[PDB]
Design a protein around this ligand. Sequence first.
Ligand SMILES: N[C@@H](CCC(=O)N[C@@H](CS)C(=O)NCC(=O)O)C(=O)O
Ligand SMILES: N[C@@H](CCC(=O)N[C@@H](CS)C(=O)NCC(=O)O)C(=O)O
Lengths: 222, 216
Amino acid sequence: ENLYFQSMTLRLYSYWRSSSAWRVRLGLALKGLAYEYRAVDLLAQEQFQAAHMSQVPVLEVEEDGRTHLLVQSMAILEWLEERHPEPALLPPDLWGRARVRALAEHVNSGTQPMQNALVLRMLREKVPGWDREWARFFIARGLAALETAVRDGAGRFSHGDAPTLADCYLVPQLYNARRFGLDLEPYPTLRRVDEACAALAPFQAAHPDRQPDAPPPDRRTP
Amino acid sequence: FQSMTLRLYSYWRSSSAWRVRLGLALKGLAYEYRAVDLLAQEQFQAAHQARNPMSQVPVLEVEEDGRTHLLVQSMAILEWLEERHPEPALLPPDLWGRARVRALAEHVNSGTQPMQNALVLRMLREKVPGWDREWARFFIARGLAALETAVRDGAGRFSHGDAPTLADCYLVPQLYNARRFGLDLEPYPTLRRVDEACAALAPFQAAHPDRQPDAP
Ligand SMILES: N[C@@H](CCC(=O)N[C@@H](CS)C(=O)NCC(=O)O)C(=O)O
Ligand SMILES: N[C@@H](CCC(=O)N[C@@H](CS)C(=O)NCC(=O)O)C(=O)O
């Protein structure tokens, strides 16, 4: 089990516009790792549960007649970094590692949970419309923290001049900001980093619109 | 050469800060305690759209070789402590166990605690008084139910095997918060058993809110 077996096969349980799954798709793409895409239709399950809980992301690792199910984006990405150290998405110096993990956690723990689908559904059940106002408030708060923290240490990307785990968390969170109609004018460093990332093939590959389960534009809910 | 010094910005009852106090205590690391008037800070944030920047607790200030580093986010700080000061280890040696322990930690870090952040609960309360209590209770119970299941599959004496890990550093403060909101903990017997094993250890006793300089 503890040998770095080379014939591990990877299967990602993903939903096209899950920001949490997207982070893992970015880790996989940036490390050049092939994987099988297992679609989990979270919209269908939401509508079904309302009329009458799949975990996303889950990275299934198969080996020697054994399956491991890895959960939590940050745990999954830390596993990818330990198992496949090149190209590194955490730097080798300890201060930089702490900085990158902090930028990731600002999103992971400080922003995304406040706008997850269960949270938003419970908000708009009690007070109609208020979920999108709430999402904009908490996303803006998270992005303001990131703009300040990123500007100190960013080169072309969130940390220096190559992609790191911090970018894996930033890019999907900016997409959600746009989804909820948040003005990104106040985050110039984040916008710059987003543009740099968007031009790279691995980011293009991981984007919601390129995923097997992506609906056409005219069949996407807000 | 200026050897490394540690200062923790903490509030006695902050679960986020407590996690870091546990990492420090478990590793036998001395640190300067710097108390933050969190209640005054939160009152100001509430009246001003939570604009006050770089003001989250915990912050671990580390000075070495004439340079100061301000480490934020409990999980990032704890991972730094594990890398900087490896013994005693708070992560297991094997890749699978490390991923399990990090997932357990993140269930609390990202999946339970943010739902009961004072700002979240304040915004709920401003809209619908009383909603904050219902919400905190719902989300903490939901988090602990999922955590009970996950911890049971792999716990020994502690959350992961027979030694404390980062998972226990997240579990123990979250259970204290559950009690604060009046939640029955009977439905989480594995979590309770682990909590009791941790409570008997000197480092857990030292990190507890009641032992902190700013405890009233
Ligand atoms: N912190 C998790 C977030 C994943 C996530 O948001 N998952 C959804 C379910 S698909 C969730 O937990 N929603 C809130 C809940 O169901 O309690 C990660 O990074 O993997
Ligand atoms: N995910 C963060 C959570 C930190 C947190 O929630 N801090 C709060 C409670 S101590 C805080 O500083 N509140 C005051 C403020 O936001 O100004 C961590 O793990 O460090």
